[model samples]
Structures are given as C-alpha cells and as structure tokens.
Target: GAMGPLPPGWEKRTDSNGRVYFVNHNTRITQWEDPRS
Candidate 1:
C-alpha cells in the first residue's frame, strides 16, 4: 500500500520563527496560545 501523494491541495510549511505547522483537507484554526514557563 502507498500514501498516494499529498492528497490534492495538501501542503507543508514552516514559519521563520522556528514554529512548525501543517494544513490539509478542510483545515480549521482555533487560537489558544500556551507558553509553559
């Protein structure tokens, strides 16, 4: 069996601030920042 590519418009990206994130298949965003210090 195979993963069959990135599934249409699916893509990967990483911010310049060293934060990694991904998006694909009708993705949604609900912001809730947490910095455990």
Candidate 2:
C-alpha cells in the first residue's frame, strides 16, 4: 500500500493483485482508482 495527501476522512488502500484503491470513512464510499487530481 501507498500513502498520499488525501482529503480528510479519506484513506488509501490496495486490494489483491496490487491494484490501488481508496475509501472514504466519512461518506461510507469507495473508489477503485486514484481520486486526486
């Protein structure tokens, strides 16, 4: 897993096969790719 400067309440994670992913604990949502600009 890698780390980056994401918005508050958000987190970065990686699933199987080393695919990058993300999640938002504040909004209870998830993203399968980089959500940053």
Candidate 3:
C-alpha cells in the first residue's frame, strides 16, 4: 500500500497539489508526513 495504515485516529488525505498529509480526528492534529513508521 502506498500509504499503508495510520495510527488509529488518523486519516490519510491529499491536497490539490497531490501532496499527502494526515489528520487526527481524535486530537484535531494535522501531520505533514507519513503517520506510519
């Protein structure tokens, strides 16, 4: 999988520029990099 799986409350998203990011609904936090290691 190109994105694999997120931490638990996080979700994968893409912007208009095709950039990837992650958002956590549980904490209202935004991640600009891969959530999985």
Candidate 4:
C-alpha cells in the first residue's frame, strides 16, 4: 500500500517486519507505521 508523495530527496524503505516507510536523508526524518503498533 503506497502511502503518498514525500518531499524531494526522500526515499522509500522497508524494515525487517515488512513495513513501509519514507525517509529524508538530509533532514533525517522518517515516516512509518506508528510506534504503538
């Protein structure tokens, strides 16, 4: 399930649990499944 668009320079990545995420290298911001889950 594609989430959406991200800022320029951001990239999509996956974790060991098979989750999706978006990360910005320059800003060091990471968006993914909520930690509570």
Encode model 1's per-residue lDDT on 1-37: one tens digit a residue.
3335444544444567766444454565322232111
Model 3 deviation from the true structure expressed as Cα RMSD, one decimal place: 2.2
Cα error, residue 6 of model 2, in Å, equals 0.5
In order, the Cα lDDT scores of the candidates are 0.43, 0.73, 0.81, 0.67
TM-score of each: 0.30, 0.56, 0.61, 0.53
List where candidate 1 sits over 4 angstroms from the true fold. 1-4, 24-37
Error of 2 at 32 (Å): 2.4
True-vs-predicted CA distance for residue 18, candidate 4, Å: 0.5
What C-alpha RMSD separates each model from the true structure?
A: 9.2, 3.5, 2.2, 5.4
Q: Return the top candidate by TM-score.
A: 3
Return the candidate ranking by lDDT, descending.
3, 2, 4, 1
> Which candidate wins on lDDT?
3
Which is the winner by TM-score between candidate 2 and candidate 3?
3
Please provide, for model 4 over 1-37, each residue's C-alpha lDDT reduced to its tens digit, 9 standing for 90 to 100. 4455555757778878998886778878887743223
CA lDDT for candidate 4: 0.67
Give the candidates in order of TM-score, highest first: 3, 2, 4, 1
Error of 3 at 23 (Å): 0.7
